[PDB]
Design a protein around this ligand. Structure first.
Ligand SMILES: [Mn+2]
Length: 299
């Protein structure tokens, strides 16, 4: 298959807030992911991080290891310390057959901080962009030399949140640095997912099909809520949820027209007691494959 459909375990057990889905075992998450029809799944905090142990739980369920989030600290640590911090991840990904590493600068991020409003998120001083981009590119050239493509995950609560900042990451990196286009964080960050795709599709190496509930996002902005408070209130949902406001097909149409190959991952943080992951992830996969057909991406 030229298009593979993935999921992310934070639908089942949240990574940032371990009180969300704490009771849901790895075994349940993986059973339901396979049963729903996903081709693979991304790293979650309950995943073994050794190759044999991770293979032992994914292979019985027909699940490929899509990729894993790896946190960056380029703003406080040297490049060589950051290459040495990503290497264990690069080795696991190779042993698992994965082709992508997902990265985000978190050294000053606030999305994991429950008590910090999202409006207080860090902004990278204008003079530090050139150095920061160069450092990201150095990790991506390092990764590429090993078969792994770096995809940068712009993210609420980080220095890469707005559309303008996505454009600055793209100006100050390349050619090995790719963009992970997350439709949910892009709209949450007041950006236009379609317009971002128009500009950067040729650099997009990985796509997260995430939806937002416009009602809840407007609540987050007005009441000054943290990222994890938005998550608990349902700021995110899946493709095809009527309460959502992301327009998926135009983004998938841009991807089709330039020949995107690879994964589309449904990543939807929700409170799983209220928003059953089996239900919402079933809805997501059903709707995203429809949208991908309508877009001519999945032919
Ligand atoms: Mn994502």
């Amino acid at each position: 298959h030229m298009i593979l459909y993935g999921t992310n375990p934070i639908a089942w057990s949240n990574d940032d807030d371990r009180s969300l889905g704490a009771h849901i075992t790895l075994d349940q998450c993986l059973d339901e992911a396979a049963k729903i029809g996903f081709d693979g799944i991304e790293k979650g905090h309950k995943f073994p991080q050794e190759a044999a142990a991770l293979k032992a739980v994914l292979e019985p369920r027909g699940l490929r290891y899509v990729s894993g989030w790896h946190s960056l600290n380029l703003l406080v640590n040297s490049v060589e310390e950051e290459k040495a911090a990503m290497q264990p991840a690069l080795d696991l990904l190779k042993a698992m057959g994965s082709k992508v590493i997902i990265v985000c600068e978190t050294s000053n991020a606030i999305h994991g901080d429950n008590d910090k409003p999202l409006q207080e998120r860090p902004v990278l001083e204008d003079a530090r962009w050139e150095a920061f981009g160069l450092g990201v590119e150095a990790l991506a050239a390092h990764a590429a030399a090993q078969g792994i493509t770096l995809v940068y995950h712009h993210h609420m609560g980080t220095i890469v949140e707005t559309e303008d900042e996505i454009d600055r990451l793209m100006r100050f990196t390349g050619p090995h640095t790719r963009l992970l286009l997350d439709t949910g964080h892009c709209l949450f960050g007041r950006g236009n997912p379609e317009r971002v795709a128009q500009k950067h599709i040729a650099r997009v190496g990985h796509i997260h099909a995430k939806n937002i509930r416009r009602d809840i996002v407007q609540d987050v902005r007005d009441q000054n809520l943290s990222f994890l408070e938005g998550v608990r209130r349902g700021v995110f949902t899946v493709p095809g949820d009527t309460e959502g406001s992301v327009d998926f097909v135009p983004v998938l149409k841009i991807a089709a027209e330039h020949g995107y190959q690879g994964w589309l991952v449904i990543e939807a943080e929700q409170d799983p007691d209220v928003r059953n992951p089996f239900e919402y992830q079933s809805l997501g996969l059903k709707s995203l494959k429809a949208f991908a057909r309508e877009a001519g991406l999945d032919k």
